């Protein structure tokens, strides 16, 4: 005995598509809850899309999100839905079922929906070159900027696993493209630079994309 | 209808720290139905307060909701580190609920720590491709709260940069950021000077670093 707000039924979708969110609720009365949908993407905060009674007698929504979500609750099966339809490319985000009774008490584990019209492409990795402006005095910054892939998943290492002290992979961000970019940097002291060669390893599973490029000053 | 909070505020252990939240139409009442939700790493939400001024069931008593003039406001008595997180507060208009932009609470967990900043040039061969991406990179910097503002020319940018942070460090509590600036190669050749101004509660005035093209 838990409290369990179990979602699923989330993944990829074209802009215009359609889905339906899953989230079965149980350790607590579903029927005695009034069970809400809210949103997060990393530029905004969190949106409240909208809210079901207890009987499904009444539902609320924000008035420019009433068209394309549709909320619906099943108390013998104490599952709640949210059907997305017409979705846009600001659609995405991860969708959480909420309870709302004194407060919202209990939440989901979230359910990401990525709404991109791309289909599987492969990486470009281009240096980020150390120079003066990436030196501060002692240490320099390097990196590489790895840009336009579908879709995720994509590994970065640095030449083949030897620097792993001080490497940064920051999360890939949706680009208005529906790529995927992201970026990977070091820092190193600037007296190695001469010495040392930097390459970084980028290898994008979905197109069997596997790119070493070295960052050369 | 606009709810706004303070972006980010900062305390130390055991101080008391208020949160407000304001109504774009006026006086916070009652019929608002405030609504007081903490978010923590790895998307983890926590309704604390609901209608106001009730506690959610199993909310420690160190939080609590309350109308502070025209404002609602979440009080930590007592702040502990891990209270450090983002507090949204949602307001009912009527028949829905808005949230506001959230508030970044910092209880500090060591001392304030300033951020390297470092500067990145497009590359050739993606300026072949024919668009242009200005990296800044922030390194190590703590609290989390910081301003990095792209300057085209002098011209403060807007709708072109995309910002990205790494997880917390478990060692030394330290983030770090990375801003890109994407344009057209044809936009990127039509200006000079591209630079990244970064405000930082560790620095004392703000930081630019700027390169030109040409």
């Known amino acids: 005995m838990e409290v369990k707000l179990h979602q699923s039924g989330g993944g990829l979708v074209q802009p215009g598509g359609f889905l339906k969110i899953s989230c079965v609720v149980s350790g607590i009365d579903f029927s005695r809850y009034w069970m809400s949908w809210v949103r997060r993407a990393p530029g905004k905060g969190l949106e409240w899309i909208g809210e079901?009674?207890?009987?499904?007698?009444?539902?609320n929504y924000v008035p420019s999100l009433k068209d394309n979500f549709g909320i619906s609750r099943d108390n013998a099966k104490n599952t709640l839905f949210l059907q997305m339809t017409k979705v846009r490319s600001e659609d995405t985000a991860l969708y959480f079922c909420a309870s709302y009774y004194e407060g919202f008490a209990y939440w989901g584990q979230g359910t990401l929906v990525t709404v991109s019209a791309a289909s599987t492409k492969g990486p470009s990795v281009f240096p980020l070159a150390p120079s003066s402006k990436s030196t501060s005095g002692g240490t320099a910054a390097l990196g590489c900027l790895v840009k336009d892939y579908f879709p995720e998943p994509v590994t970065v290492s640095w030449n083949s696993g030897a620097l792993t002290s001080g490497v940064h992979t920051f999360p890939a961000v949706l680009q208005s493209s529906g790529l995927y970019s992201l970026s990977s940097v070091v820092t190193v002291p600037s007296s190695s630079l001469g010495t040392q060669t930097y390459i970084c390893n980028v290898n994008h599973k979905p197109s069997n994309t596997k790119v070493d490029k070295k960052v050369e000053e | 209808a606009v709810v706004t909070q303070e972006s980010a505020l900062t305390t130390s252990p055991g101080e008391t720290v208020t949160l407000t939240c304001r109504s774009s139409?006026?006086?916070?009442?009652?019929?608002?139905?405030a609504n007081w939700v903490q978010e923590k790493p790895d998307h983890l939400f926590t309704g604390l307060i609901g209608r106001t001024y009730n506690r959610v069931p199993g909310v420690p008593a160190r939080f609590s909701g309350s109308l502070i003039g025209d404002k609602a406001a979440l009080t930590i008595t007592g702040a502990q580190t891990e209270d450090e997180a983002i507090y949204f507060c949602?307001?009912?208009?009527?028949?829905?609920?808005?949230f506001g932009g959230g508030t970044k609470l910092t209880v500090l967990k060591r001392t304030v720590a300033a951020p390297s900043v470092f500067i990145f040039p497009p590359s050739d061969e993606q300026l072949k491709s024919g668009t242009a991406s200005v990296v800044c990179l922030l390194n190590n910097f703590y609290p989390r709260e910081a301003k990095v503002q792209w300057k085209v020319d002098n011209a403060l940018q807007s709708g072109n940069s995309q910002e990205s942070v790494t997880e917390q460090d478990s060692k030394d509590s330290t983030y770090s950021l990375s801003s890109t600036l994407t344009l057209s190669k044809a936009d990127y050749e039509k200006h000079k000077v591209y630079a990244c101004e970064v405000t930082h509660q560790g620095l004392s005035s703000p930081v630019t670093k700027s390169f030109n093209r040409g």
């Open positions: 139409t006026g006086a916070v009442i009652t019929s608002n139905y």
């Open positions: 949602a307001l009912w208009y009527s028949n829905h609920f808005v």
């Open positions: 079901i009674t207890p009987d499904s007698n009444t539902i």
